[PDB]
Amino acid sequence: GKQYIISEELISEGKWVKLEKTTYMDPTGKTRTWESVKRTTRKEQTADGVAVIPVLQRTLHYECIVLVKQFRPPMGGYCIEFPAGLIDDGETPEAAALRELEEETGYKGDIAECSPAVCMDPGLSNCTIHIVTVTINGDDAENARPKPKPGDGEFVEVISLPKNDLLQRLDALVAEEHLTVDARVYSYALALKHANA
Amino acid sequence: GKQYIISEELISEGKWVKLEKTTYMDPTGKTRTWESVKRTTRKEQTADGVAVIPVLQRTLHYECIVLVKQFRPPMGGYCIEFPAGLIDDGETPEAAALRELEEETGYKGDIAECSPAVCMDPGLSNCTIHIVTVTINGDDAENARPKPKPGDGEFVEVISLPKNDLLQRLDALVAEEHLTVDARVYSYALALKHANA
Ligand SMILES: Nc1ncnc2c1ncn2[C@@H]1O[C@H](COP(=O)(O)CP(=O)(O)OC[C@H]2O[C@H](O)[C@H](O)[C@@H]2O)[C@@H](O)[C@H]1O
Ligand SMILES: Nc1ncnc2c1ncn2[C@@H]1O[C@H](COP(=O)(O)CP(=O)(O)OC[C@H]2O[C@H](O)[C@H](O)[C@@H]2O)[C@@H](O)[C@H]1O
Ligand SMILES: [Mg+2]
Ligand SMILES: [Mg+2]
Ligand SMILES: [Mg+2]
Ligand SMILES: [Mg+2]
Ligand SMILES: [Mg+2]
Ligand SMILES: [Mg+2]
């Protein structure tokens, strides 16, 4: 028997996040519940945000993956992640990705590809994002002196690491600093390693 | 200046998840708030769970990545993910990995590598997992006819896709029906294609 949602009761709602009690039908026709999380900023027929995989390309160097370091309140510490942001109203995933990349890193990129909506943590929330691959011409005079343009309550640090040695460099950051690496960044790094050998 | 947590005020706590209002100090010395989510099952000094990257190997065959498909209440639909589960009390990440892999797919594997705790969705929750790379000897009799041993309220479908064509195969599954691929699975698949550049 196929499963389906029966009802979604609001438990508590903040200005950005809300908790819900989800009642659904299981394969055996039995009613069960689940505690779900959702963002209050999600628009209809639109993913919550985007994560950007910024590939910095330079003539004299191997490719680099541009990451950002930010203090994350929910984590109680600093985290290393792909640049990311919530999609603004009417804005396409691609546009959101280029804007957030420039805002958080100062780099002006070009779209390479865009994934369909993927889930962030399906066992807990309904949060989804588009993973957008963007290339950056690191030799262009325009990208010589990049500087972020963060908002009021935002201070991002840019950290670019070699694509051919990503996993190792991420491990070093974890060991030497008070940092947590994002699961998507690490999954990306593991496959780069697994593909290689 | 270094940012840090000033206080955490409980907003709503459930059986599995809770919502809190976090107050922290920004780089300038000003206090700001943030809405954060946490799992109530989280034990101090340990990550919430593990995600397993199972590589099914067989002589003279392409390698396959074992994934699971399950109905996810928060998403209101089915999702394709790496087998994963919460870490049991006192259980090590590696043991959780092999245990969850067997319960969800029936396969018995060997640990290849284990990542440090990485965050699932930092801008929203404090959820963390260890991504454990595991290899499955597809030529061993015990792995010939593996059968999932799920819980009372767990219903999983095993889907193994070729590692050599992972991203394309994921797209083909999504073209067939309403399905959402996990962001970590997609990040992994993307890097397999982006590697060697
Ligand atoms: N939970 C919150 N509590 C208080 N204020 C909030 C919260 N979420 C967002 N905001 C406000 O909206 C802004 C969105 O920042 P983005 O930069 O536009 C989005 P970013 O934070 O970068 O996240 C991008 C993706 O990764 C995150 O972990 C989520 O998965 C998200 O989908 C935050 O910087 C803050 O000003
Ligand atoms: N939110 C919830 N509401 C109601 N009951 C719950 C909830 N979370 C866990 N449970 C209970 O604990 C079990 C944990 O299953 P795992 O299988 O042990 C953990 P799994 O679901 O697989 O997730 C593992 C990792 O990937 C998922 O996205 C999770 O968010 C986590 O990051 C659930 O099957 C259910 O019995
Ligand atoms: Mg951001
Ligand atoms: Mg933004
Ligand atoms: Mg932003
Ligand atoms: Mg599970
Ligand atoms: Mg379990
Ligand atoms: Mg399980």
Swiss-Prot record, chains A, B:
<keyword id="KW-0007">Acetylation</keyword>
<feature type="binding site">
    <location>
        <position position="100"/>
    </location>
    <ligand>
        <name>Mg(2+) 3</name>
    </ligand>
</feature>
<feature type="binding site">
    <location>
        <begin position="34"/>
        <end position="35"/>
    </location>
    <ligand>
        <name>substrate</name>
    </ligand>
</feature>
<feature type="binding site">
    <location>
        <position position="39"/>
    </location>
    <ligand>
        <name>substrate</name>
    </ligand>
</feature>
<comment type="similarity">
    <text>Belongs to the Nudix hydrolase family.</text>
</comment>
<dbReference type="InterPro" id="IPR015797">
    <property type="entry name" value="NUDIX_hydrolase-like_dom_sf"/>
</dbReference>
<dbReference type="GO" id="GO:0016779">
    <property type="term" value="F:nucleotidyltransferase activity"/>
</dbReference>
<dbReference type="GO" id="GO:0006338">
    <property type="term" value="P:chromatin remodeling"/>
</dbReference>
<feature type="binding site">
    <location>
        <position position="104"/>
    </location>
    <ligand>
        <name>Mg(2+) 1</name>
    </ligand>
</feature>
<dbReference type="InterPro" id="IPR020476">
    <property type="entry name" value="Nudix_hydrolase"/>
</dbReference>
<comment type="function">
    <text>Enzyme that can either act as an ADP-sugar pyrophosphatase in absence of diphosphate or catalyze the synthesis of ATP in presence of diphosphate. In absence of diphosphate, hydrolyzes with similar activities various modified nucleoside diphosphates such as ADP-ribose, ADP-mannose, ADP-glucose, 8-oxo-GDP and 8-oxo-dGDP. Can also hydrolyze other nucleotide sugars with low activity. In presence of diphosphate, mediates the synthesis of ATP in the nucleus by catalyzing the conversion of ADP-ribose to ATP and ribose 5-phosphate. Nuclear ATP synthesis takes place when dephosphorylated at Thr-33.</text>
</comment>
<feature type="binding site" description="in other chain">
    <location>
        <position position="16"/>
    </location>
    <ligand>
        <name>substrate</name>
    </ligand>
</feature>
<protein>
    <recommendedName>
        <fullName>ADP-sugar pyrophosphatase</fullName>
        <ecNumber>3.6.1.13</ecNumber>
        <ecNumber>3.6.1.58</ecNumber>
        <ecNumber>2.7.7.96</ecNumber>
    </recommendedName>
</protein>
<keyword id="KW-0378">Hydrolase</keyword>
<dbReference type="GO" id="GO:0070062">
    <property type="term" value="C:extracellular exosome"/>
</dbReference>
<dbReference type="GO" id="GO:0042803">
    <property type="term" value="F:protein homodimerization activity"/>
</dbReference>
<dbReference type="Pfam" id="PF00293">
    <property type="entry name" value="NUDIX"/>
</dbReference>
<feature type="cross-link" description="Glycyl lysine isopeptide (Lys-Gly) (interchain with G-Cter in SUMO2)">
    <location>
        <position position="30"/>
    </location>
</feature>
<dbReference type="GO" id="GO:0030515">
    <property type="term" value="F:snoRNA binding"/>
</dbReference>
<dbReference type="GO" id="GO:0047631">
    <property type="term" value="F:ADP-ribose diphosphatase activity"/>
</dbReference>
<dbReference type="GO" id="GO:0019303">
    <property type="term" value="P:D-ribose catabolic process"/>
</dbReference>
<keyword id="KW-0539">Nucleus</keyword>
<dbReference type="InterPro" id="IPR000086">
    <property type="entry name" value="NUDIX_hydrolase_dom"/>
</dbReference>
<dbReference type="GO" id="GO:0019144">
    <property type="term" value="F:ADP-sugar diphosphatase activity"/>
</dbReference>
<dbReference type="InterPro" id="IPR020084">
    <property type="entry name" value="NUDIX_hydrolase_CS"/>
</dbReference>
<dbReference type="GO" id="GO:0044715">
    <property type="term" value="F:8-oxo-dGDP phosphatase activity"/>
</dbReference>
<feature type="binding site" description="in other chain">
    <location>
        <position position="86"/>
    </location>
    <ligand>
        <name>substrate</name>
    </ligand>
</feature>
<feature type="binding site" description="in other chain">
    <location>
        <position position="72"/>
    </location>
    <ligand>
        <name>substrate</name>
    </ligand>
</feature>
<feature type="binding site">
    <location>
        <position position="154"/>
    </location>
    <ligand>
        <name>Mg(2+) 3</name>
    </ligand>
</feature>
<keyword id="KW-0479">Metal-binding</keyword>
<dbReference type="GO" id="GO:0000287">
    <property type="term" value="F:magnesium ion binding"/>
</dbReference>
<dbReference type="GO" id="GO:1990966">
    <property type="term" value="P:ATP generation from poly-ADP-D-ribose"/>
</dbReference>
<dbReference type="GO" id="GO:0006753">
    <property type="term" value="P:nucleoside phosphate metabolic process"/>
</dbReference>
<feature type="binding site">
    <location>
        <position position="84"/>
    </location>
    <ligand>
        <name>Mg(2+) 1</name>
    </ligand>
</feature>
<feature type="binding site">
    <location>
        <position position="100"/>
    </location>
    <ligand>
        <name>Mg(2+) 2</name>
    </ligand>
</feature>
<keyword id="KW-0694">RNA-binding</keyword>
<feature type="binding site" description="in other chain">
    <location>
        <position position="121"/>
    </location>
    <ligand>
        <name>substrate</name>
    </ligand>
</feature>
<feature type="binding site">
    <location>
        <position position="104"/>
    </location>
    <ligand>
        <name>Mg(2+) 3</name>
    </ligand>
</feature>
<keyword id="KW-0832">Ubl conjugation</keyword>
<dbReference type="GO" id="GO:0055086">
    <property type="term" value="P:nucleobase-containing small molecule metabolic process"/>
</dbReference>
<keyword id="KW-0460">Magnesium</keyword>
<keyword id="KW-0808">Transferase</keyword>
